Design a protein around this ligand. Structure first.
Ligand code: HEM
Ligand code: HEM
Lengths: 145, 145
């Protein structure tokens, strides 16, 4: 269950998530756009899903893409803030899961975000240990898809 | 015009928004559920739009309602964090406006949130001065609907 995935996050994993978020979450506009644009760069097959955003090749200049990217970072802020109460983490994760289920995004496709997260983390010198911790958080959402 | 509306957020208004948010934003789960449930209590005619959340009279005990309410508070957090840059405030406001336009929510009905905000603020000893500041922020979203 999603609760199981959530309840499994250990103290060490939560520590790594919080420490790295202190940095990557400090510039939501910059890192959010980097995250989304990297997804498009490395997984071009996903571009079609974001037609509402218009020309995503415009990057930062695209106001719809910028608004979407900043907001995505607040979903992550939400997750990080709920780490110590699995009950609250689960209800917010299911909320965002619905946003993706309606767009026909499978658990496997949602996992495509792990590559971009790993790259953004690396840009701030957060290595594999941190990428693995984030993959565990993403897996909580995957349990809901 | 959303831009002209954003221009109404003067130094004094921004300060009142930040000062009051420091308190109401400190308990997103508690104050978010209070805000949403007050909207339902005071404007029963809006409950029909929230069919996805199930039985909203259950308040905090309703997982979907709790997830929705917490997330709503992060949208407000987002707005507050963008107060320094109007172009960014506008792009995030338009993102959330679309979420409501697709739900068929007009500027007038969106404005029904002012009553609940005034009440939640009053419960934390923040009077009309603050309620009016928040009404100006809500007005930016209304301009985009
Ligand atoms: C860290 C992981 C991710 C987070 C936290 C996240 C968060 C969000 C948020 C907050 C929204 C806006 C929901 C709405 O207002 O309707 C959104 C929309 C969307 N997401 Fe994600 N997402 C993630 C990964 C992905 C991935 C990997 C895909 C695709 C393979 C995806 C596809 C979509 C699509 C198609 C939309 C709709 C965009 C639009 O038309 O506005 N998401 N996402
Ligand atoms: C401070 C004001 C408000 C904020 C910041 C806000 C924010 C949000 C957010 C973040 C969502 C989730 C969007 C999504 O994932 O699709 C949402 C959904 C929704 N909002 Fe609001 N909202 C506000 C006021 C209102 C008001 C006053 C109404 C109705 C009169 C309204 C009606 C809706 C509806 C119908 C949904 C869809 C719920 C669902 O089925 O999940 N909102 N709102």
């Amino acid at each position: 269950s999603v609760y199981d995935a959530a309840a499994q996050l250990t103290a060490d994993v939560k520590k790594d998530l919080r420490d790295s978020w202190k940095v990557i979450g400090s510039d939501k506009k910059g890192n959010g756009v980097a995250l989304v644009t990297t997804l498009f760069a490395d997984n071009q097959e996903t571009i079609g899903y974001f037609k509402r955003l218009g020309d995503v090749s415009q990057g930062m200049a695209n106001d719809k893409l910028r608004g979407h990217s900043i907001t995505l970072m607040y979903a992550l802020q939400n997750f990080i803030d709920q780490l110590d109460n699995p009950d609250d983490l689960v209800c917010v994760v299911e909320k965002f899961a619905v946003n993706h289920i309606t767009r026909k995004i499978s658990a496997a496709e949602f996992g495509k975000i792990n590559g971009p997260i790993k790259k953004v983390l690396a840009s701030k010198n957060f290595g594999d240990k941190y990428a693995n911790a984030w993959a565990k958080l993403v897996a909580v959402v995957q349990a809901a898809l």
